[PDB]
Design a binder for this molecule. Sequence first.
Ligand SMILES: NS(=O)(=O)c1ccc(Br)cc1
Ligand SMILES: NS(=O)(=O)c1ccc(Br)cc1
Lengths: 262, 297
Amino acid sequence: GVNEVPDYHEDIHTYLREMEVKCKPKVGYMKKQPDITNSMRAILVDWLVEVGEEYKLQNETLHLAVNYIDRFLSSMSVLRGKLQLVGTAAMLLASKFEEIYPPEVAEFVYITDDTYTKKQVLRMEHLVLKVLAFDLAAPTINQFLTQYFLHQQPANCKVESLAMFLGELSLIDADPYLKYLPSVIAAAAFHLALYTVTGQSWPESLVQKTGYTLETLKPCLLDLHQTYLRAPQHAQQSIREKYKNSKYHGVSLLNPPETLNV
Amino acid sequence: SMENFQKVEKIGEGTYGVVYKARNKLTGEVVALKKIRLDTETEGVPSTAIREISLLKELNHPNIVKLLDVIHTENKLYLVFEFLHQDLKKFMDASALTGIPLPLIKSYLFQLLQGLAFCHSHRVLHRDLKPQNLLINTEGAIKLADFGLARAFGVPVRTYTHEVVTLWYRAPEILLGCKYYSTAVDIWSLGCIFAEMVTRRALFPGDSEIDQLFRIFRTLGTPDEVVWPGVTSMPDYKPSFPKWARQDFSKVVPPLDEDGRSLLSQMLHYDPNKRISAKAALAHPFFQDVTKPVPHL
Ligand SMILES: NS(=O)(=O)c1ccc(Br)cc1
Ligand SMILES: NS(=O)(=O)c1ccc(Br)cc1
């Protein structure tokens, strides 16, 4: 019913697809950042995941903060020692956008081990707002996932958790995931979770909604499957830790399937 | 920054700053200037302003107030908005003897629903619809304004801030403290506004949350399971509430034709799931003959 906004879900979906093009970071910006690497970004995002946990923030808030960072770094070159300042400010902005009860600024200063002053965080906040021109209502992987979940029958707790987990793993690694749109990564995450748990594939109802087939999702699937299989070995583990817990049904303890049979 | 604007007069104030009517000395454009103080040593940019700007920047529709510019300093933020002559509350008050012509009521409702359909279509909840927040000009237009309490939602919705919507205009699902609310809470407000335009009087002027429910009940009948599945399973619901019958809208809103009455009730349905969308409301027979009159200002 009204919580799923029947009279609007199509209009909404259509516009998020248009807006996710607009909020898309530059795919190749890392090569153009002289003092920042994919590795460093990974470490930053991984830390934001932890911050997300310590303060019990929405996952949506984490996805937003990464969008904010990626766009900021598409336009501004930043020295490594100020990378964390960008990230702290983005988490702050995302919190203020998305959360009922955002942490106070002081708390965001606290988490950087006083690497930075409050004055620096507030000022970086302003700079980030200017650079993004206040376009903060970015479509996330999560905004698409929750939409795709409605096509399940019945809704499966494990599928939902597992698709979230996969979705978050993508946040970490700019290569390859910056070349995929949110809606694409989400579809891959949901196919891959639904296949792993139940054995089923991307429904046709969603083929109709999205225009995406397994054919079109194949590249993104190949990458994501690979990221899934290698996840225990990845240098960043906060997301695996996170999705061991009871809350997410211990999906990160599930063995990934060895083939996708496509 | 602001050297091109001349302040003409104060037009109201808020929590983070005052609103002044101003004029571009170079273009002549009359504008509304919202000054929002930045807490540059404490809390930074207010989240209410981050939401208002980001959402207004996306919403471009004839019935939504236009944000024209955002002027930055290190210390202030100035939001430049189109100027509209006055708000609906003032209009109603000015019209409290002479009455408001029905064509303009119908015109204004139609536009409000167009504005609102566009918000919902764009995953934005307004959450503060009331006369004071609706702006009109001299040409017979009305526009949703004050998106400070607005929120971009996902599908399905999740738990959002509960302390939302001015009491009088607050949907029963919020009052009964439901986990989830959605687009229907905006429709409720317009429903109350619809009634109010017709009678020039607040439909449910409660002096408290318990008093707000009591006012709704007697007017619409105390909801049971048969009218609203879940009302009794809802928190804040009390099996103790009196059992009032529904009053005939012919007494609640006498001036109103059978179509108006019918649209009004669908807008005021208890069950959020049964309550009419803005999009469906646009199709309602009430609007078959809608025109665009100018108001007597
Ligand atoms: N990039 S900005 O100066 O924050 C800006 C925001 C909104 C408008 Br509408 C115009 C300009
Ligand atoms: N800041 S606002 O509430 O959208 C607003 C816009 C225009 C006038 Br005129 C008055 C108020």
